[PDB]
Structures are given as structure tokens and as C-alpha cells.
Amino acid sequence: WWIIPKVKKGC
Amino acid sequence: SSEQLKHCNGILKELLSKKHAAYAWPFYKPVDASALGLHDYHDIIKHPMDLSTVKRKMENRDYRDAQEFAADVRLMFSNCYKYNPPDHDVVAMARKLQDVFEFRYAKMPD
């Protein structure tokens, strides 16, 4: 998933 | 021939496998521009592509040769490189998944 869309992944 | 399309299907299955899921997941489905707040996506990307669309085309016997399959997969990466600045995580993920694709596609049976 995205913490910030496109910018930083969370998973 | 059909042998080259089997090689393409093998690559597709690999790209969708758990082995590469950590960097392949952004490409599993079409970019949901509205959900991600990317309201300029479809003005910049005129030919969206993703792995679910490639898989649908493969299952429907849409691809007639390996070059057509490769063009779609590479279009998916190209869209990512066009829309996203290179310092964003999605670009690092695309580059790694394209590494997987290009190194195996190059082993096409002759």
C-alpha cells in the first residue's frame, strides 16, 4: 500500500 | 511461435508471483487515478497498461507474437517513468520489475 500515493510505499 | 508465447506466459506468471510481489503490486491492476488523487494521470498517460490487462489479453489469445506482448509490458513501465519523478518509490519498484522482465525476456527460445 502507499503511505503517500506513488511517493512512499508502506508494505 | 506458440513456443515463444509460452515463454511470454511464463514471464507473466513470474511477474505475478509472490517472489516479486514486493515491487510488482503497483502494477497488478490499472492505476486508480481517482482513488490516489492523481487527477492529471489520464492527461499525461494516454495508453494505460497493467499486468491484469496483459493477463486478460494472454488468456484471450490476443497476442500473436512475443514482440506484441513485450510492447505492452514495456508500455506499462514507460507510463510509470513518464508520470512519476524518478525519486518516488514507484519508479524504483518499476525499474526492479523491469529488470526481472528484460533479463528473462532476453532468454527467448530461438
Author numbering:
A (entry chain B): 1 to 11
B (entry chain A): 346 to 455
Text from the published report:
Overall, the peptide backbone itself adopts the same conformation and all intermolecular contacts in the AcK-binding region are also conserved. Minor differences are a 180° flip of the Trp1 side chain and a change in the nature of the contacts made between AcK9 and the C-terminal part of helix αZ and N-terminal part of helix αD in the BD, which is distal to the main AcK pocket (a region less conserved between BD1 and BD2 domains). In the structures with BD1 domains, this AcK lies within a channel formed between conserved Phe (in the loop following αZ) and Asp (αD) residues. A tyrosine residue replaces the Phe in BD2 domains and is positioned in the opposite direction to the Asp, leading to a loss of this groove. As a result, AcK9 is oriented toward the solvent in our structure of the peptide with BRD2-BD2. This difference likely contributes to the significant differences in affinity for the two domains, illustrating the power of such peptides to achieve specificity by probing surfaces beyond the canonical binding pocket.
Within this class of proteins, the bromodomain and extraterminal domain (BET) family contains four members that are transcriptional coregulators and that recognize acetyllysines (AcKs) using a tandem pair of highly homologous bromodomains (BDs). Despite heavy academic and industry investment in this area, the generation of paralog-selective inhibitors has proved elusive because of the extremely high sequence similarity between the bromodomains of family members (90 to 95% within the acetyllysine-binding pocket residues). Using the highly conserved BET BDs as a model system, we conducted three mRNA display-based RaPID (random nonstandard peptides integrated discovery) screens using a single library (which contains >1012 unique members). Crystal structures of 13 distinct peptide–bromodomain complexes revealed highly diverse structures and binding modes among the cyclic peptide ligands.
